[PDB]
């Protein structure tokens, strides 16, 4: 009927983490290679993603219990959960009014089409928007949003994962804090938790769709040379 | 006492090549990651160099006799001669008035110091300027400038080179056209040829100094992640 310290301290760490690794002004985006509307958006979006990965790694490093895992398991979790963490956090900039990520003047306002100029179709780009909408509508609290990202990152079901027993416990601790929170601090959210977990299953699918499309793109050297070393390494298979 | 067709046709190809691969307005530079004056210039200059390599490969592909070499020998020559070709061509933007490469407003006006913010010192950055000055003062014709780059690219003395006998003949054909040209079309340039060849020996040194400094930088992952795949690959040793 009331959250305990360890839990409350878990929420404080995660929220501070997201804050130290997510800017609501999107000021660093000018440092990226400029957008251009033949895979013309590829250079900008590669920098966007590569940037975000550094952020996700920053957030992860501060997820309680994560630094305790082995370098190998940390890397296995990041690599597999990375793309999804990026989709979850991107929701912050998503705009239901225009069905696009609004991160600045018309320049940094990424709509479904600018992603196509980055090597992606619409058949697979449709579920992303479908996902960004349902997630948005959940009007999550920063606490639940931040938790969901931490819960998603500690999914034991990741190819490459060793200590799937510990990683499993951690995720359970997090899922519990998310349930208690929603229960005591989130009025009207009785179905919520279950809706949030469902969102992770969707991420799996979007994750698998990206892998495929990225695989083709990364295989063509004229395109991969547009990617950044960090991306090439995080989405690469040389594990 | 007068150039022959094959020679004249060699000069026409090289000049057209340089033209199709060198812009005197430097308009594409806005596409690079913006400059910033902790290796703050590294992101911009990496894009500058990576860009230039694509250009050098474009020029090379059109050097007469080059496409006839084996993929392997083409790659061996590019990799080893790349950095030097970049220093030779950069001379076009060098400004003796301010001892810097002027490629745009204060933004793209790279002076000796902005390179330091890219992982380089002054002990080794001094010979580059010393070299850019002497070269500039030679007031080369576009024909001699273009030749020199072709002659430099066909230096048989490159680690990795197989057919060092053919590559050797090609370079000789080019050195001959450069001598005839200077002799019949370049009044007052009696010492020139010899001065130009000396410039290649200097490139060797600058080339060796870069290798070392780049090696350190590329070894530190926090820095290499700033480089581009093409650079990482051209200056890398995985031959």
């Amino acid at each position: 009927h009331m959250l305990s310290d360890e839990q409350m301290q878990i929420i404080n760490s995660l929220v501070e983490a997201h804050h130290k690794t997510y800017d609501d002004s999107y000021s660093d985006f000018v440092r990226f290679r400029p957008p251009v509307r033949r895979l013309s958006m590829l250079p900008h979006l590669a920098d966007l993603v590569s940037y975000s990965i550094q952020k996700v790694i920053g957030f992860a490093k501060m997820i309680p219990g994560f630094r305790d895992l082995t370098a190998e398991d940390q890397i296995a979790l990041l690599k597999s959960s990375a793309i999804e963490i990026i989709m979850l956090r991107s929701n912050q900039s998503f705009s239901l009014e225009d069905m696009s990520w609004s991160c600045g003047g018309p320049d940094f306002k990424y709509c479904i089409n600018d992603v196509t100029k980055a090597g992606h179709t619409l058949e697979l780009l449709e579920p992303l928007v479908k996902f960004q909408v349902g997630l948005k509508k959940l009007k999550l609290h920063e606490e639940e949003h931040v938790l969901l990202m931490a819960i998603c990152l500690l999914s034991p079901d990741r190819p490459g994962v060793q200590d799937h027993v510990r990683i499993e416990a951690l995720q359970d601790r997090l899922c519990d804090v998310l349930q208690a929170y929603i229960r005591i601090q989130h009025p009207g959210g009785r179905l919520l938790y279950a809706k949030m977990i469902q969102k992770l299953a969707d991420l799996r699918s979007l994750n698998e769709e990206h892998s495929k499309q990225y695989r083709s793109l990364s295989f063509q050297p004229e395109h991969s040379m547009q990617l950044t070393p960090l991306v090439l390494e995080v989405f690469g298979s040389e594990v | 006492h007068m150039l022959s067709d094959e020679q004249m046709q060699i000069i026409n190809s090289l000049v057209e090549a340089h033209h199709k691969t060198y812009d005197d307005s430097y308009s594409d530079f806005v596409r690079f990651r913006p400059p910033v004056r902790r290796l703050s210039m590294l992101p911009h200059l990496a894009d500058l160099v990576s860009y230039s390599i694509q250009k050098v490969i474009g020029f090379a592909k059109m050097i007469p006799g080059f496409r006839d070499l084996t993929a392997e020998d083409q790659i061996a020559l590019l990799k080893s001669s790349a950095i030097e070709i970049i220093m030779l061509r950069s001379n076009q933007s060098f400004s003796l008035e301010d001892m810097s490469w002027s490629c745009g407003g204060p933004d793209f006006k790279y002076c000796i110091n902005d390179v330091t913010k890219a992982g380089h010192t002054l002990e080794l950055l001094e010979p580059l300027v010393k070299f850019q000055v002497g070269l500039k003062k030679l007031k080369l014709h576009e024909e001699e400038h273009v030749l020199l780059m072709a002659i430099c690219l066909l230096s048989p003395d490159r680690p990795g080179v197989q057919d060092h006998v053919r590559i050797e003949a090609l370079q000789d054909r080019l050195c001959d056209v450069l001598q005839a040209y200077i002799r019949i079309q370049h009044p007052g340039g009696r010492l020139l040829y010899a001065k130009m060849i000396q410039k290649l020996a200097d490139l060797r040194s600058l080339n060796e100094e870069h290798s070392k400094q780049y090696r350190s930088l590329s070894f530190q992952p926090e820095h290499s992640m700033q480089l581009t795949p093409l650079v990482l690959e051209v200056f890398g040793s995985e031959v």
Binding site: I57, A71, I75, L78, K79, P229, E233, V239 | -
Partner: peptide
């Protein structure tokens, strides 16, 4: 190897 990813995780 994961050169980059290793350095980043500190």
């Amino acid at each position: 190897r994961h050169k980059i990813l290793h350095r980043l995780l500190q």
